[PDB]
Design a protein around this ligand. Structure first.
Ligand SMILES: [Mg+2]
Length: 241
């Protein structure tokens, strides 16, 4: 038996592009409805930074309150005035709904996943807070293409902690040496698969970059997730074409 674990964000769905889309829409809102000028982009830039700086959480968080607060702060830090929670909410929920709407599985990614599952067990392994990730999973309707879906923020530890990989292995009833991890992030997906002693790691190198020394090195590298079947058909995973 063989299994393939897939990363989610930016591997199977365009998360970053979806987020950019969300900012584009907020900018439009602030500029058209509220007549903001370039403070629109300034505020959005601030939120992006705040988003990027969130780390902890699992002990307990209301992500909606936290991220609404990023907006509230960014508005006040840019335009001053009294804190405006209502406007913060208007921005947040526009950004959120816009991004979730943008997240979809391309038809060739759907076909690819369908083909893989005929021969191997498929699992989605995605870092991030429970609510946000489950919302993304619902938005791109991907749960039906996998035998299981595991979310880092629902677990005790996330990628690259080997524990979450061993959990995934048990969930599918396989061993780490039966498994392949596919993802676009060296420090989570690849390091994690290396930590957990998986059969192989596949790095989707979208940026066409040479890993700086001291970075994790994957077993295999592809520029697109659509290259996976041919690759897996060559290593000990899928039968030859
Ligand atoms: Mg990713």
């Amino acid at each position: 038996m063989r299994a393939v674990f897939f990363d989610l964000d930016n591997t199977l769905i365009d998360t970053a592009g979806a987020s950019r889309r969300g900012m584009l829409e907020v900018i439009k809102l602030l500029q058209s409805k509220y007549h903001y000028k370039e403070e629109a982009e300034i505020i959005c830039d601030k939120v992006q930074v705040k988003l990027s700086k969130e780390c902890f959480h699992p002990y307990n968080t209301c992500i909606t309150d936290l991220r609404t607060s990023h907006w509230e702060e960014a508005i006040q830090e840019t335009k001053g005035g009294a804190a405006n929670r209502k406007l913060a909410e208007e921005c947040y929920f526009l950004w959120k709904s816009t991004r979730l709407q943008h997240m979809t599985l391309a038809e060739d990614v759907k076909a690819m996943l369908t083909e893989l599952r005929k021969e191997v067990r498929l699992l989605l392994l995605t870092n991030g807070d429970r609510q946000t990730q489950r919302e993304k999973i619902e938005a791109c309707a991907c749960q039906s293409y996998f035998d299981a879906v595991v979310v880092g923020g629902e677990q005790r530890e996330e990628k690259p902690a080997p524990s979450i990989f061993y959990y995934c292995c048990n969930l599918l009833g396989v061993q780490p040496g039966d498994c392949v991890m596919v993802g676009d992030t060296l420090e989570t997906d690849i390091q994690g698969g290396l930590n957990a002693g998986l059969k192989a790691t596949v790095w989707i190198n979208k940026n066409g970059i040479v890993p700086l020394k001291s970075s994790p090195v994957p077993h295999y590298m592809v520029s697109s997730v659509l290259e996976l079947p041919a690759l897996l058909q060559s290593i000990d995973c899928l039968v030859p074409r």
